[PDB]
Every structure is written in C-alpha cells, then in structure tokens.
C-alpha cells in the first residue's frame, strides 16, 4: 500500500537538535513535491518546508535557517533535521505527498498522502515513563493500563499493530499529581476468554520507553 | 491571511458550506485552493485541491469553488463521519508557500442518540503487588459527548480517588471516556464491592467489581 511511515522525535532541550524521518511505501520521494507540516497543541496545520524534485528546497519563516530538508533517495526517506529547537517548535510533524502538476514541475499545492505524525516536544522539563498493567475482566474486554507518565503523549498498539480490530484506545486522564494514565482494550467475545494471550505495545517517546505487557485473562 | 469561522453547525443528510477568506494575492490570483479534513488524533485527509477537483476516490458529495477571494467547501448528504476540522489552503501566490485557514470545526446535529457500553476493571494482581490499586471504568459508543460517572463503594457514594476525562470522538464517530478510582489496595480488599455508575441523557448503567 502506499504510505508515509514517520519516525524520530521525542523531547528534546531547548536549543538542541533532533532529526525527523519520513520513509515511503510504493512511490518515490524524488517523483514527488514532498511538505512538511506541523501542528501545535491544540492549534491548527501550519507549512513547514516542501523540497521539489531537483532538490531544490523552500522553508516558512519561522524555521528558515534553523531547519534542513532533504532526501535520501536509496533508501526513500525524507528527512526533517531540526536544529536550534525554540518551545514553540513543539508540535506534532507530518510528513506530505504532493503530487505536482502533470506536464510540469511545479507542486499543485495540496497532498494526498500523509504520514501519521510524530511528535516532537521543546521543554527543558523532566520526563516519566509508564508503568504498565494488565486489566482482565473479574462480549467483554481485556486491556493494559498506562499509568503515571509525563508528558503526553503515548500510543498503544496490540501485537505489534497486526490488531486493530475490536481495539480501543481512550483518552488520557490529568491525575491528581499532574502525571497521565490511559487505558487501551479489546473487545472479544465473552466466550473467547478461552485463553488467548494479547500483547499491548505502549510507546512514550518523550522518555525513550517501550513497554510490551502481556495480557492473559 | 487565510480565515475560516471557528465553528459550523449542518443537519444530518442535508449540507453545510463553509468559506475561507483570503486577499487577491492567494486566493483571488491563483487556482491552488485545497481543503483537508482532520479527525482528532489522525492526519489531515485532502478532499479538494486545485478549487473545485475531487482528489482520487474522494466521493462526489464534496465541492468546492472560489468567488473573489473567498473559497467555500459544500459537503452535502451529511454523515456522522463528517464531523471534524476542516481546513483550507492556498498557494500563497508571492513565493513558494503554503497558507492555512484556522479550521472550522464541523458539528452535524439530528445524529441518533447511542446510549454507552460500560466496562469496568478491577486492580490487577500485577499492580496490587506494586502496592497500589486501580478501578478502570470504560465509557464508549455514546451520543453525544456528555456523561456523568459517580462512583460507589458497596453502597456508599464516594468522591474521593475519582478523576474522570473529558468525552473524546472515536473512529465510530461515538464519544469514548475514562473514569479511575484510585484506592489503597486495603481499601481494595477490605470493601465488599465498587461499582461505576454511568449517565447519559437521564439513562444510567451500572457496573460493579469485588475483590473476591
């Protein structure tokens, strides 16, 4: 299928560095107008930078000299180095397939194929990774509790992603202490607690932590 | 500066257009109008590029157009999937550069009212043995996104140890949220049983663990 698969980020001090990836599936980086763009907390998508197919790359003010983009066409990835990082680069980055136009080299200005995002935080703040659970019933549900992290955010998948259906993954909860927990569960057939094993893949990238919890009920 | 109202409201199965307000130099000068769709925690989708093409796939019900300055996305036949945030952009027609509207978030009303499915967890073993204690109380598939969570220990109502989260839309277009009871795990084992009382629209469920 084609796709965009991001990788890189996490916390980072202010005035550091960290370099973003942007690996594609199915098409070529090089026959294509490549964005990035951002998004702050609770803000809306803002450009970044696109590098056209000669190399040849553009930058929003913000960023201009402080940010590179770049491909490496033997292993189609784009890159995103980030360099003198400020706290409001803080944001979630996509990765974008602009297609361009037919006859032309010039983009056509909108992308049709995005990457997931990854998140890329500036803070000079301490981190916390979470200690994993497993929830068992005692159609039902089974699950993993993500509890006691900072910051946000972290992202659950089951059996290394070859599980989405029946999977639910809840919003994260503000403690009492400021630190977050969530809960993430799959819903099966009461009687296929037949005691099939599940294993919840919980990654905190702000803290460099990946926890797999296996879960039998 | 490209501007969008903050918020639209349409009808299910009718239509909503919603506009994006730039200067002749963008929107007014150059035919580079896109317009993405965004739900919570996913990527933008694109659904319109160039003022008025549909991207590959991207069904028939959703237009575009430009008078003057001012793009306008039609989304007609209104589904619960439409709900989200959408977003125009322009070529910024100077240089090189992309400019994005604010967002509009879309609320599409006359949705079937869904009554939510409760799941609720007692303290593992694992986490017992850390010495703490946990209840996980589930709320998904509910419409709209508003719930009340009181919790009870055997019978007694109790406030203390409860923090509840905001409703957040899932992939369904259902809202989903969480409610925890953080308790010592003698309080755990000492109490004859917990329960999580769900409300939504006047429509409480409950639901109850015991250590046993």
């Known amino acids: 299928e084609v796709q965009l698969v991001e990788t890189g980020g996490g916390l980072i001090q202010p005035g550091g560095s960290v370099r973003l990836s942007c690996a594609a599936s199915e098409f070529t980086v090089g026959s294509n107008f490549m964005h990035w763009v951002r998004q702050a907390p609770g803000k809306g998508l803002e450009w970044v930078s696109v590098?056209?197919?000669?190399?040849?790359?553009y930058y929003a003010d913000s960023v201009r000299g402080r940010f590179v983009v770049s491909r490496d066409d033997s292993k189609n990835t784009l890159f995103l180095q980030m360099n003198s990082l400020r706290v409001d680069d803080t944001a979630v980055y996509f990765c974008?397939?602009?297609?361009?136009?037919?006859?032309?080299?010039?983009?056509?200005?909108?992308?049709?194929?995005w990457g997931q995002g990854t998140t890329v935080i500036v803070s000079s703040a301490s981190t916390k990774g979470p200690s994993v659970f497993p929830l068992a019933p005692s159609t039902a549900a089974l699950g993993c509790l993500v509890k006691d992290y900072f910051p946000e955010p972290v992202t659950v998948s089951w059996n290394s992603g070859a599980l989405t259906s029946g999977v639910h993954t809840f919003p994260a909860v503000l403690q009492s202490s400021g630190l977050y927990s969530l809960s993430s569960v799959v819903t099966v057939p009461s009687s296929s607690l037949g005691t099939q094993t599940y294993i919840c893949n919980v990654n905190h990238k702000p803290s460099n932590t990946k926890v797999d919890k296996k879960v039998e009920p | 500066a490209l501007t969008q109202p903050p918020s639209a409201s349409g009808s299910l199965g009718q239509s909503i257009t919603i506009s994006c307000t730039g200067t002749?130099?963008?929107?007014?000068?150059?035919?580079?109008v896109s317009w993405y769709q965004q739900h919570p925690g996913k990527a933008p989708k694109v659904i319109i590029y160039?003022?008025?093409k549909r991207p590959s796939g991207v069904p028939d019900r959703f237009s575009g157009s430009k008078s003057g300055s001012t793009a306008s996305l039609t989304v007609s036949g209104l589904q619960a999937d439409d709900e989200s945030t959408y977003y125009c952009s322009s070529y910024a027609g100077d240089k090189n550069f992309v400019l994005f509207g604010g967002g509009t978030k879309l609320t599409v009303v006359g949705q079937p009212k869904a009554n939510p499915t409760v799941t609720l967890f007692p303290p593992s073993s694992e986490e017992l043995q850390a010495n703490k204690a946990t209840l996980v109380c589930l709320i998904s598939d509910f419409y709209p996104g508003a719930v009340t969570v009181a919790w009870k220990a055997d019978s007694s109502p109790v406030k203390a140890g409860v923090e509840t989260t905001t409703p957040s839309k899932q992939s369904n277009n259902k809202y989903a949220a969480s409610s925890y009871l953080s308790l010592t795990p003698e309080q755990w084992k000492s109490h004859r049983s917990y329960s999580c009382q769900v409300t939504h629209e006047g429509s409480t469920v409950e639901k109850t663990v015991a250590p046993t």
């Open positions: 974008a397939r602009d297609g361009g136009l037919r006859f032309l080299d010039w983009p056509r200005w909108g992308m049709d194929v």
């Open positions: 160039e003022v008025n």
């Open positions: 590098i056209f197919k000669g190399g040849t790359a």
């Open positions: 002749r130099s963008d929107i007014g000068a150059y035919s580079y």
